[PDB]
């Protein structure tokens, strides 16, 4: 109170010094049942991929991309990412997502990075130099090698010019590398533009095939059709909580309700457009919202030039939330309730007043309106005054304020 | 309760304190307004168990113990009038305490007349109190005692018409209902202004903080702070202006309590139309109702009249009455009710000889 | 041909419950007492959005196509009421003018005595569909009375639309205009009446 | 930056002048009442109940005070009543007499 | 009379409506003020010739 009034002395009164507010005891998050998980498993367990000169792209759209199975997929011989950290991906959203898939030898998987060079990076699959995405691989010797060599996997050995980023080209005309004419046939500097790894199961670890998939992500004007998993908490009724139901953030108390929403409606609004009810997206019950209990806190005091005891009123708060006493104005702490009634000293509200009285304490009482009297009425009886008092009464009226002027330029601009 | 917004709101300084000091003065004034109207009685007077009021019947306006303990008319009045950091506060006096004041004022008035406002309540029989209130309008008190049944009836009937009007109407009490409506509309306007963008990216504070990084989010929140602080200053300024109107109305109601209920006003049209006899307070939601009892002169006749009359060369003037003639004979009457006395030397006074007065007439003055 | 719309083409504009209250909102609505084109399958302008209605129980009426070219040069939205359930797809379609009774791809989805009413609109790359069904006394024209249309789907398709056509025996078309309406929500949070604010001075 | 200080200092001064206009209207209503109390209580003898203090008004005396006025209202208060039987009229030679 | 400005003013909500409502309350009260002073007489009394 001394700090609120900016004074070391406080006169008799009731002063508001704070606001009480019950705090959110925990956070709730609720979203629909975690469903329509993206088809990443259809690429990562395909029967085989395409040859790297003709890499195969999966469109990922309209699903939840839970990358956490990939975060724990320790069978991946690598899981690199560029522009973005892998652990962050479960927080994100995108318009389109892609997975680009192929087989190559381990000694050429190292060409799959931003700004790399060599026949794969030059002529088969060029990443951007500012690439945002991820590169995944696993050993596939037992899947992609064959006795006498599996020639069914190929790469573009040479081209007239290097690929642009994500340029795809599956044409197989003879490449004329120099002054010797191609003449429609294989020869020196008349190369058929593809060659094969010929994968043998007896190959060494860098000669062996690896299955490779490159993840890539974009966010456009068109809607974010791909998002991470909406992990959700338990639902906590009958306490103060923070909550998030779908996009509806707030703070309050959640309770069961008598309301009858229509099947498409998600939440409800009061007459002034303030939200007051919600449908839980996992179990479709209607919950009422009421605010966390709050109100002004007032300090009730005799003057400090008499005593240093005080009482405290929590305006409109029920005493469960905070001698101690429930008034209709709010819970009152530190005042003794009395069964007598007296004229009002300090006013509290709803018929209650407080005073400091004699060993001394602050007391709280229902206010006296005046002494009760029955006038001795009947027909044919009268009272007539036999004496008088001349009385002098004082009345005090304001007539004028202190006169003020302001140089508005000197106040504003100094 | 956003910590990001709360720290920006500190940069505006005292505005948030001085709005609450302003609204605190409005709230504290409403208790004083109610105190100055109703708390004009020193002691809680109560009515006798006997009801020997000379045929007048106050049972419609007196407390009902089977009811709060309001009168019948106070229950009609109480039935016909009908959270984003916002809080309402209770009045200091409860509706039952206000009904104890209108009860004490009314019991004092009926049992002791005007006397309880000037000192101790002095009992007087109600028909004799009404005889003095007839003298206060210039009608001689025998006009009441000779017509008491007819004045007690017709008072009772005029009170019955108050019950029938308040039971049947849907507009007459609307002066209290409009005060309820303006204060509901003011809070709905204040809350609806939370939905406004004020040119910010959104009106939802967590939405701003999700879309934008710290430096741009701080720019967007300062628009909501600017528009919501202007929205709240607009509300508090309008409540300060609206409270000044209610205080002027409460000072008028406190003056009608003193001069109409605790007295008999001679001020024209102050306590209803007609010559005022008395009035009764009834409590209503956020206000007071006065039932102003007045005398109305009703069935006039024409007469010939003269300012003075000649007797033995002396000009006679009436002490209190007016001279009138029925066409052949001359009388003096009291002025606000026709009752003809024969003209005598003690109904009249002399001033000089006949010759000065314009329109003097010749008639005998009887000397008793 | 033209007929009057009366008080029809109101829909629940948002997924918000409101009870025993009047709520005023601005959205693409069919203006009250406007007239609507009546047909017995042309390509039509879409404007800002369409109210479509029909009386149907044979299912001669079967679906719709929406787009700019409708065909080949860029993607378009196909909708068909297959008797199993409604089928929806977005492709660079090149199908025939309309299928009838014997009287690349980027998105996909799978779900007379009665007047059946549908509202279609496109906002910021979401395609919104609302509908309702009611019995009717007189097939010739839309009935004088009130009934609010409920949302079916809210598709993230992103593609542009400026024209549409019916796939299909008679139907009504009218266009949604940006209007302010005052909507009456009852104790059960159904819309039960409305005022089109720009209709007449009493509505204002 | 100066335009933010101008905006806030100008709003600060508008708030002050608005509340001084609203407060000066309250002090004018009080000065109009004090001027009426001087005409009716000091320059006359008011019959208006409780206008010039409690009891029946005899006279009142003005005293100056800083920013205001003080009225010393002299009034007559009846003090020591006794009960009596009473009658509206008395009957003499078959005729009613009234006081 | 600018549509470009009117759609930006509409971001401020109730302010424009409540300014018009305040001036309408002031205007209706001026007719009330005049009737409370002058219309105190029930009948249009006329002086004799
Ligand atoms: C969300 O998923 C939960 C868990 O499967 C569903 O809740 C169960 O629904 C079945 C329906 O037969 C009940 O038998 C169970 O008692 C429910 N509770 C639990 C804890 O399993 C819920 O129905 C789903 N909600 C939606 C909207 O799909
Ligand atoms: C005072 O007036 C009331 C009128 O309300 C009288 O009570 C009613 O009397 C009538 C007959 O005159 C009855 O039909 C009603 O049932 C009574 N009750 C009510 C609540 O109206 C009352 O009797 C009168 N008192 C005196 C002493 O005459
Ligand atoms: C004065 O006016 C009253 C009415 O205000 C007259 O009293 C009425 O007289 C008729 C006679 O038939 C009765 O039917 C009514 O019931 C009476 N009313 C009341 C309330 O008692 C009265 O007669 C008039 N007196 C004079 C001298 O004109
Ligand atoms: C004017 O008033 C007087 C007195 O009331 C009337 O005179 C009386 O008239 C009646 C007959 O109508 C006689 O019985 C009385 O003896 C008369 N008294 C006196 C004192 O003369 C007179 O009639 C009235 N005049 C008119 C024109 O009405
Ligand atoms: C009132 O009475 C007086 C006295 O009887 C009348 O005075 C007479 O008036 C006439 C006409 O002017 C004169 O001829 C007489 O000489 C007067 N007599 C006296 C004694 O003065 C007077 O006229 C009467 N008034 C009226 C209006 O008739
Ligand atoms: C392949 O399918 C299995 C099925 O159990 C699954 O566990 C695994 O995560 C999938 N992907 C890889 C890379 O193994
Ligand atoms: C403080 O209280 C004392 C009595 O306790 C009194 O005499 C004195 O005037 C008061 N004020 C100051 C400033 O001391
Ligand atoms: C407040 O809470 C308690 C316990 O829930 C309840 O008994 C009490 O009645 C409530 N307060 C009031 C003023 O009713
Ligand atoms: C106050 O009165 C109530 C009954 O009216 C009683 O229960 C209570 O014990 C009393 N308290 C004191 C302090 O006497
Ligand atoms: C009141 O009047 C009644 C009936 O006339 C009578 O019996 C009673 O004595 C009177 N009371 C007084 C105190 O005069
Ligand atoms: C009247 O009251 C005064 C005191 O105010 C007292 O001195 C005086 O004796 C009283 N007179 C009578 C006759 O009672
Ligand atoms: C007689 O009195 C009535 C009622 O006041 C009035 O209307 C009438 O004009 C008067 N007679 C004459 C002749 O004026
Ligand atoms: C009153 O006026 C009439 C004319 O209407 C006139 O004859 C008469 O003498 C006048 N009387 C007085 C006293 O002026
Ligand atoms: C339809 O409305 C247009 C509005 O301009 C009007 O010209 C036309 O006559 C109307 N047709 C019918 C048949 O209602
Ligand atoms: C639609 O009709 C065809 C046969 O014409 C049927 O094969 C198909 O399953 C139906 N569509 C769906 C979504 O079931
Ligand atoms: C939609 O239309 C706009 C304007 O013609 C154009 O910029 C945009 O690229 C179009 N989008 C599609 C998917 O056709
Ligand atoms: C609302 O629903 C209840 C059952 O939940 C039903 O009794 C009532 O008739 C419905 N309609 C209205 C207008 O309340
Ligand atoms: C008058 O009568 C009442 C009731 O009989 C009694 O209490 C009172 O003492 C009497 N005297 C005075 C001075 O009021």
Residue numbers in the entry:
A (entry chain B): 299 to 620, 641 to 676, 689 to 744
B (entry chain C): 745 to 811, 813 to 827, 855 to 1140
C (entry chain C): 27 to 66, 81 to 143, 165 to 172, 186 to 242, 263 to 298
D (entry chain B): 992 to 1090
E (entry chain A): 745 to 793
From the paper:
Changes in the spike (S) glycoprotein in these variants are under scrutiny because the S protein has a central role in engaging the angiotensin-converting enzyme 2 (ACE2) receptor to mediate cellular entry and is a dominant target of neutralizing antibodies (nAbs) elicited by either vaccination or natural infection. The prefusion SARS-CoV-2 S trimer is composed of S1 and S2 subunits separated by a furin cleavage site. The S1 subunit contains the N-terminal domain (NTD), ACE2 receptor binding domain (RBD), and two subdomains (SD1 and SD2). The RBD transitions between a “closed” (“down”) receptor-inaccessible conformation and an “open” (“up”) conformation that allows binding to the ACE2 receptor.
Multiple variants that originated independently in different geographical locations show three amino acid substitutions (K417N, E484K, and N501Y) in the RBD, which suggests convergent evolution and selective advantage of these substitutions. The S-GSAS-D614G-K417-E484K-N501Y (the “triple mutant spike”) showed reduced binding to RBD-directed nAbs DH1041 and DH1043. These results are consistent with the inability of class 2 RBD–binding Abs, where the E484K substitution occurs within the epitope, to neutralize variants that harbor the E484K substitution. We identified 3-RBD-down, 1-RBD-up, and 2-RBD-up states, as well as intermediate states that showed one RBD in the up position and another RBD partially up. 3-RBD-down states accounted for ~12% of the total spike population and showed considerable disorder in their RBDs, with the disorder being most pronounced for one of the three RBDs and its contacting NTD. Taken together, these data implicate the K417N-E484K-N501Y substitutions in the RBD disorder observed in the 3-RBD-down states and suggest that the E484K-induced conformational disorder in the RBD tip Hook structure may be the source of the increased RBD-up spike populations due to weakened RBD-to-RBD coupling. In the spike, interprotomer interactions made by the RBD in its up state, and secondary contacts that the bound antibody makes with adjacent RBDs, may play a role in stabilizing antibody binding to the E484K mutant, thereby explaining the retention of high-affinity binding, albeit at lower levels. Patterns in the interprotomer vector network indicated that the triple mutant and B.1.351 spikes were similar in their protomer-to-protomer relationships. For the triple mutant and B.1.351 spike structures, the RBD tip disorder presumably reduces the stability of its contact with the adjacent RBD, increasing its up-state propensity. In the B.1.1.7 variant, this occurred by modifications in the interaction between SD1 or SD2 and S2, whereas for variants harboring the K417N/E484K/N501Y RBD triple substitutions, RBD destabilization was mediated by RBD-RBD contacts.
